[PDB]
């Protein structure tokens, strides 16, 4: 029962580095099956999460769990509503983690994708989607009301235009004004998700709180109409961030490279100086909510990648990192899949690459 009495700069700072539950609860399935009445946390082909994963999980050295959910497919009626099955499974998975002293980021994931969006960033979408924030949060934000600093709100994962040109990427000095709208609705929607939060007070008057600027990607943050969200509290906003950098070596299919050559850190030391002086050295901590080199069957470099990637980051008190892991591991022979984030193997709860892991807890 120790309360939310915290800065964001003491629950970031007292984060070592996280794990995601990738590709379990976040998995959703389609529109005209809306809502589901059953949980969709193995539709994606991962075991449900158990108990004894976090252990192993939390033995390695993470000290936090980001659980991605994707809440939309589940709910029913004008207000949204959460069903029972939903909410006690989340707090199952989120009191796995809890009891092992663990910090745990939970959010909204995959209620935008190809299929169907349960918000839009635009004008013509502007009223459904905060309807939908508002009524999600409420509900999230009362199931887990008691709960001390080490649970974090995460409001959306990588807001976007999806199936846009620029849905995933646009330069931040030169957004289109279908950009532009995007950024002020998102900086909207973020108000909206907070004030819910905060309205059904106790804890949640003063839990932190992680919000994403357009993609969840440092154009959306460094972009100069992204704001961060009025609180009534003090200090408890963290900014969310994803970077699979560099994207070459971390995430292309397509034109990719399995070496971690020393000019691409010039990638991540761009990345971090433009946090820290848009948001580190103005005491507003940043949570690097997503992040992984695709296995391409090049170890010994994935290995240079997080050496350099974690140490680079540990000079900054007020950054942590959340390692996303979607349990699939094999590539072909050319390790050109960029979606291999395998980490730990669900099913048999060994380690896949043991050198990461020890490399990044080096730091």
């Known amino acids: 029962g120790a309360g939310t009495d915290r800065s964001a700069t003491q629950v970031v700072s007292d984060m070592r580095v996280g794990w995601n539950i990738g ?44 659980i991605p959910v994707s809440w939309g497919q589940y709910t029913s009626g004008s207000d949204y509503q959460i069903p029972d099955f939903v909410m006690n499974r989340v707090k199952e998975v989120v009191d796995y983690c809890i009891v092992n002293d663990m910090y745990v980021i939970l959010n909204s994931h995959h209620d935008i994708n190809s299929d169907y969006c349960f918000y839009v960033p635009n004008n013509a979408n502007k009223d459904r989607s905060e309807k939908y924030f508002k009524s999600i949060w409420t509900q999230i934000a009362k199931e887990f009301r ?32 279908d950009i ?13 998700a907070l004030d819910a939060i905060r309205a059904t007070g106790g804890n949640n008057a003063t839990r932190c709180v992680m919000v994403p600027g357009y993609d969840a990607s440092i154009e959306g943050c460094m972009t100069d109409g992204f704001k961060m969200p009025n609180d009534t509290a003090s200090g408890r906003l963290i900014l969310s961030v994803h970077a699979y950098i560099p994207y070459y070596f971390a995430l292309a299919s397509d034109t990719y490279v399995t070496r971690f050559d020393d000019n691409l850190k010039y990638d991540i030391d761009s990345f971090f100086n433009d946090l820290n002086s848009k948001f580190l050295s103005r005491n507003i901590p940043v949570v690097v909510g997503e992040t992984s080199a695709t296995n391409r069957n090049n170890t010994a470099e994935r290995v240079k990648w997080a050496d350099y990637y974690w140490g680079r980051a540990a000079r900054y008190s007020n950054v942590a990192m959340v390692l996303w892991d979607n349990n699939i591991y094999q590539n072909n022979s050319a390790g050109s899949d960029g979606e291999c984030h395998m980490y730990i193997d669900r099913n048999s709860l060994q380690w896949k690459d043991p050198e990461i892991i020890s490399t990044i807890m080096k730091h």
């Open 23 to 66: 590709n379990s609860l976040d998995s959703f399935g389609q529109s005209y099956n809306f809502p589901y009445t059953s949980l969709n946390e193995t539709y994606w082909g991962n075991p449900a999460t158990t108990k004894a994963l976090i252990d192993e999980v939390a033995k390695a050295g993470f000290n936090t769990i980001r």
């Open 146 to 177: 008691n709960y001390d600093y080490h649970l974090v709100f995460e409001t959306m994962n990588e807001p976007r235009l999806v199936g846009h040109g620029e849905e995933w990427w646009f330069p931040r000095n030169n957004p289109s004004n």
């Open 180 to 192: 532009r709208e995007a950024v002020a609705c998102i900086n909207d929607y973020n108000q909206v």
